[PDB]
Amino acid sequence: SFSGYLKLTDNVYIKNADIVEEAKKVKPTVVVNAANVYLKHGGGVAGALNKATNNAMQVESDDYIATNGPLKVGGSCVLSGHNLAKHCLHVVGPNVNKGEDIQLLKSAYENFNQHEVLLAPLLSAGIFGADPIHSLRVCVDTVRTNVYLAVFDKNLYDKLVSSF
Ligand SMILES: O=S1(=O)CCC[C@@H](CNc2ncnc3[nH]ncc23)C1
């Protein structure tokens, strides 16, 4: 199962890890993707997850968008987890670099409550522009199901733990 995570709360756990490598090893029921509304998985967590599926995530995602249109900022959809997980929960956090309202980060984390356990990144952090310390605080104060957070950067992981 999940191993080497530091327990932060009753339901939130954290580890310095690449979420792609964690998903390949653990094969969780749900891996969260840090998606954008178009499901265009170019970089960050989305680009890395999609590359690990040999672009199968992007082919599925383009069919989903052709049928349904774009997601909302703060919204999500459940698609296949391909070779990484049973399911991928594509969740759109606000992108601060595009002036999206950071208050939508709590709505984005509420999607996690529909799943008993998830492997996830810190939403809206990284290339989405938000402060990761804030993202972890909104995660702990919003998600009630069991979440295993993979933080790619070691320096940031240590700062997140030491300021918790
Ligand atoms: O640690 S960071 O520099 C700042 C906090 C948010 C993460 C978001 N990206 C990722 N998080 C987890 N696993 C990943 N694999 N590929 C990308 C990625 C980036």
Swiss-Prot record:
Coiled-coil stretches are none
Q: Which reaction does it catalyse?
A: Thiol-dependent hydrolysis of ester, thioester, amide, peptide and isopeptide bonds formed by the C-terminal Gly of ubiquitin (a 76-residue protein attached to proteins as an intracellular targeting signal)
**Start and end residues of each Macro domain:** 1-164
Activity regulation: the record says: Inhibited in vitro by GRL-0617.
Which topology term describes how it sits in the membrane? Multi-pass membrane protein
Q: What the protein does? A: Responsible for the cleavages located at the N-terminus of the replicase polyprotein. Participates together with nsp4 in the assembly of virally-induced cytoplasmic double-membrane vesicles necessary for viral replication. Antagonizes innate immune induction of type I interferon by blocking the phosphorylation, dimerization and subsequent nuclear translocation of host IRF3. Also prevents host NF-kappa-B signaling. In addition, PL-PRO possesses a deubiquitinating/deISGylating activity and processes both 'Lys-48'- and 'Lys-63'-linked polyubiquitin chains from cellular substrates.
Full protein name: Papain-like protease nsp3
Going by the entry's taxonomy, the superkingdom of the source organism is recorded as: Viruses
The organism named in the record is Severe acute respiratory syndrome coronavirus 2 (2019-nCoV)
Q: How does it assemble?
A: May form homohexamers. Interacts with N protein.
Subcellular location(s): the record lists: Host endoplasmic reticulum membrane
